[model samples]
Structure formats: C-alpha cells, structure tokens
Target chain A: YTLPAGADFLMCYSVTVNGSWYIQDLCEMLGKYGSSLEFTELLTLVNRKVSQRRQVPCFASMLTKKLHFFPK
Target chain B: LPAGADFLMCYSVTVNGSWYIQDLCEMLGKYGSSLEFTELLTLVNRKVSQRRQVPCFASMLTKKLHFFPK
Candidate 1:
C-alpha cells in the first residue's frame, strides 16, 4: 500500500519489493533528497555508474555494490 | 519428526507462489512419507513464514549445535 504524502524517508525505505515503496515512493524520496535532481536523472546517474563497472571483465558483483546507495 | 529433503525442496520452490492443499498433497506423494498431507503443509507454512520475516542465511552449527558453546 502507498504511504501518505510527505511520508518520512525511513517509512519509504521500509517497504518490500512488492510494496508501494518500490513503485514510485523511492523516486519521490530520491527527488526530495537528491539535490533536486529529477527522478529520471537520478535513475540515469545510478544506471551509468553501474554500467561503467559492468564494462569491466567479470565484475557483476562489484557493479551491483556500486549501484547500492542509502536513502539519506 | 520433521519432514525431510522432499519437503524442503517443495517449500523452497513454491514458497513464492500461492498454495493449494490438493496440489501440495500430490507433490508430497513423490516423497512417499507416512506424514499426513495436512501435517506436512503446516510444517511448510511455518518455514515459509519464518523465512519471509527474517530472510537470512543460518547454520546449524551457529544455531543449534552451539546452543551451549564448547
């Protein structure tokens, strides 16, 4: 289920993959805390960084780690 | 006694899906156990719910074997 608007950051992060948190809440949280970056921009930044690591040979695990970021 | 490998495999594969009693009993037949289908289903439910809540890797040595410590 979706959290109410203006929900706390921790509340947004607490959801499972199947929960509403994953659907659009993660993007909203990112927008508020990501220096006003657009959601697509933030997603693109994350994707580019992850892609760079994967271009290296046999670095699948390391690429995933690079993509990991705390909500704060 | 606890159910064995067949029960374990069945739970692992199907835990992400919805369950039906009849379908589960049919699967349990492959293992050929004296345990009643309902009894085994309960055990599987216990395991599935536990894993969903905790979602961690555990070991017998750390959990049961070292209960009192050497």
Candidate 2:
C-alpha cells in the first residue's frame, strides 16, 4: 500500500513549514488574484528587485493582516 | 452550479510528450481563476519560450476527473 503524502492545502489561509505556519505576504495572500500575475513574470520581478536592493526590517508575523477586511 | 463554456481553451501540446496529472491539475486549477484569456495565452507562450525543458510523466494516469465547489 502506498501511503499518500497529503497534498491537503487550504486549511487556513496560511501554510506551515517546519512546524510553523508562514502566512503569505500581500502577494500570496491574494489567492485567486495571485493567478492573475504570471508566475514567471513575478519571479522575474523578484529577481530584479532582490538583485538591486538590501533592507533590514523585522520579519512580520506569520499571520498577517487580512487584505479582504478593512481595519476598523 | 452554472456550467460556463468559458472553461475551454486551446493547448499547444507536443505529440507523445509526457504530462504529470498532478502538475497539470495544479496548473489548471490556478488557470481557471485567472480567466483573462491573454493570461492563458501568455502561459502557453511561456511554455513555448522554454521549449527544451524536460517533460514529466505520470506514474499512474487516473481517469477519475473529480470536481468540488468551494
């Protein structure tokens, strides 16, 4: 019997890696919308920006503010 | 559920090229949400642009086509 490695994504809006849930940034947070930007195009943009910039800031928490809901 | 013919498109497939069901399904699921026809065109165009990449094979081709509504 081949035990399946679960591909059960879509639990919370976040995904876990190494026992910690890493919430997606504004980009990944936009699930259906993420599909709008071509993956290769976004990868190209990331490569270009990362190639030219350096910045230090505290990493935001895994569970980010939901974009769908306006903060009141 | 509404059946929309908007879900059909042309694939520029190479004859006898192997395709992994999982990868194909993953791409298709995401593709459906990006309904802009040009987006799909760009995807195939991108594949065309990268012609030499190794093709993938499905270990088992499950004929089961299942869908669930969100």
Which 10-residue window of candidate 1 chain A scores lowest in summed lDDT?
A56-65
Fnat for candidate 2 (0 to 1): 0.00
Tens digits of per-residue lDDT, candidate 2, B1-70, equal 1112112223333574444333344455777455433333334334443444222111111111223345
Give candidate 2's error at residue B29 in angstroms.
2.3
Best by DockQ: 2
Tell me the TM-score of each prediction against the true structure. 0.18, 0.22
For this target, which candidate reaches the highest TM-score against the unseen true structure?
2
Q: In model 2, where do residues sit more than 4 Å from their true spots?
A: A1-72, B1-26, B53-70
Least accurate 10 contiguous residues by lDDT in model 2 chain A: A56-65
lDDT of 1 by residue, A1-72 (tens): 222122111111111465542334345546554656532234333333333331210100101011234456
Which pairs clash in the backbone of model 1? Answer: none
Question: Per-residue lDDT tens digits of candidate 1, residues B1-70?
Answer: 1121111112222665554343344546653265433234334433334342211111111011111223
Docking class of 2: incorrect
